[PDB]
Amino acid sequence: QSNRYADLSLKEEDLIKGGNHILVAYTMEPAAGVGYLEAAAHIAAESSTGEFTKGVDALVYFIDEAKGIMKVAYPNDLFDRNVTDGRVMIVSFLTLCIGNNQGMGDIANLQMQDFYVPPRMLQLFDGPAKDISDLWRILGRPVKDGGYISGTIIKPKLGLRPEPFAKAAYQFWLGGDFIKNDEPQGNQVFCPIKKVLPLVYDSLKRAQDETGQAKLFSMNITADDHYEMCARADFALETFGPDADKVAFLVDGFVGGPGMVTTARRQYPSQYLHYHRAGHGMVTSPSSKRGYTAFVLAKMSRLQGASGIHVGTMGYGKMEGGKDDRIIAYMIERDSCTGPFYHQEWYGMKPTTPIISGGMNALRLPGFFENLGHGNVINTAGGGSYGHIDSPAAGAVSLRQAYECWKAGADPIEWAKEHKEFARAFESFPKDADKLFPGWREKLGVHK
Template sequence: MNPKQQGYVNLKLENPANGEYLLGVFHMVPEGRLNILQTAAEVAAESSTGTNFRVNTETPFSKVMNALVYKLDLEKDLVWIAYPWRLFDRGGNIQNILTYIVGNILGIKEIKALKLLDVWFPPSMLEQYDGPSYTLDDMRKYLGVYGRPILGTIIKPKMGLTSAEYAEVCYDFWVGGGDFVKNDEPQANQDFCPYDKMVKHVKEAMDKAVKETGKKKVHSFNVSAADFDTMIGRCEMIINAGFEPGSYAFLIDGITAGWMAVQTLRRRYPGVFIHFHRAGHGAFTRPENPIGFSVLVLSKFARLAGTSGIHTGTAGVGKMKGTPEEDVVAAHGILYLRSKGHFFEQSWTKIPDMDRDIEELVSKDKAHGVILEDDSWRAVRKCCPIVSGGLNPIRLKPFIDVMGNVDFITTMGSGVHAHPGGTRVGAMSLVQACEAYLKGIDINEYAKDHKELAQAIDYFSRASKDAM
């Protein structure tokens, strides 16, 4: 290594988890003349204080801010890097962190593969960031839904319905027993579905559904927009439409709108469920992509930023690319107070991890109890996994079995609307599939007395075979 590279390597770094560093693990394959250690040093330099040459303007203090390569696994092409977290904007700025650790470095020519697989945040750093405010527990309390997934849908077709047609589908799903409806990720202010009319009609449809069913409902509105003022204007339009607090969420296309939009919503509207749609994430997260970051990394940063929920995939059960090793690890990583990632065990506590109160909270959290209600200073609150992409009533139990819990929102699209009986009957079949799971009854047995579920089983079983 040259003298510059040596300044970014310390394979004898004592206690990297001492609270001074954000830690990251990369899969890294060099391109060209550099070996893996030299390449790792170049990556550490580019992602902290350095450039491609040693500069004469370094100071003793600036060197303290160097990212450090502190561990290698040559057999698996893995590199561990410690980043002094004081490098980052102290305003709790997520985009600033990502600009460092998965910014320019993804484009340097010394690498053939560079993927951030896992990150670890020290308690001292967690204190600087927002974390979620309105959580899954708050939504459950509003809906009165406990012990099962929150049953939701994405309106389909995703585009082409008028405002009135869109609201009609919402109404049908809600009166069929569903809890949660969301705009799809491209929903905006299209000429055939004006945003203001869509909001107005959804409010009317929700009021009618609540009156008829006697149960609360939630709608997630996509507020992603071309500029700040339009985004905030959409939020205010929804609030001023007269929706009851808790009955609406703000969906933001986090990858394409950006982290500034995500954090603006979190800070402006702490009493609203902030729904992070991850459209575009596959360019970074798909396992076959050698450059980027993992689903776990994206999900962890969403929790750090304060999103209430983020899409985490269907673990291979649905139509989207994913595995339990990726999707379930990510879901657990944002849901629990303490969880094992691909390389790090992340504790989201802000006070000492072995504090007696924290141990009690971890135990209660594992038992699916509600935590951090009146002691939010102790830890970062949970972020809800949102599950969508090719699920239907017959795939609900298989996904729950893979997930290992029911603490998620499922948003089935065609899994509801493709039902031969239509959306309302499709929602009924979803509710019945959930009832069968909760009662421990095989859905085929349960379907003998529930014709809506029987129709769903017949249709989706045949549709799955035809698609193969």
């Protein structure tokens, strides 16, 4: 199989310049007693064709047995095409490149680290129809570098009845921009969509009228049945009426699958599509050697047409993540970026928003922004908002002030002296305050 499904003398530069292959880089470990090349070649065979057939064979063009790396070239013609409109489909990419090869007996483990999409394949993906600039426009902020969008999830995340949920939304929106459903909250019997959603809209209107600022809501429309998704979407837009453009659609894209993402993307392209990656950890965890990484997941989501996707807090919060995850944001938001193995040109395809969630607060944000290089993000900070000693609204304000502080290159301690909400965040998260800003109590004139 090595003779047919491997050509380690191929130059990657030529494969890229040719534009006739999707390239994929894996970590791979063969089973006991199995040679590295024969394993790689077998993976290539099982991931493609198993005289014309030879022209569409997947080819191993590189292996590094010492580092446990293998790279495969997949001819473009392998991938499935819609009969309806000729576009390619991500499910075909998954089926071929990370399908059956995950259950091979002669392979100990196999995980995708990166992939390269050539010009023609890129032209045939949907790509995003909306992005963060559309939200900036609504919020009356610059459509270029409009900056930080403050947000949250209502707490508790599940269990609130319609009236309580809507009141909490109103209270937050008095200070913040963006609210979203928790990933599992939809039409539970204790909080039916037909009851809560009209109440949420009342809160949005009330907050808009009182603050004179636009507000945003991201609704979960995740469902097994395509027509259930469309039923929820249709009802949401009708309910929000003249503000319906401010409704984003949240889809649990990892557990829900490409079918659900595309339903939102293709049936409601004019609504910001919010990809929630709940479940992703089962393969993207640092301890995992199977499936694919968070980087790969995020890059795929852009092709699928997500307007934004969760990328974590990059080591500045909780969960499993690190500072190097900033490359994930770069790949989905830039027009030209280099991944772990492949440089990618996006040729004007719209950027997918990096959405930050999981343990951030006003005190941690300056460091996060410094690492990232910007604040063009949506931050749904649950703890950062409700954790504020004064109010969820004050928490939202403190988050925004933290961005304005970093953007101005100002001293956080001195910035606090002229921004009450930000200052009160020090007292809201004293353990973080002591670590990040030792001596803050003395400088801010706060109790010991």
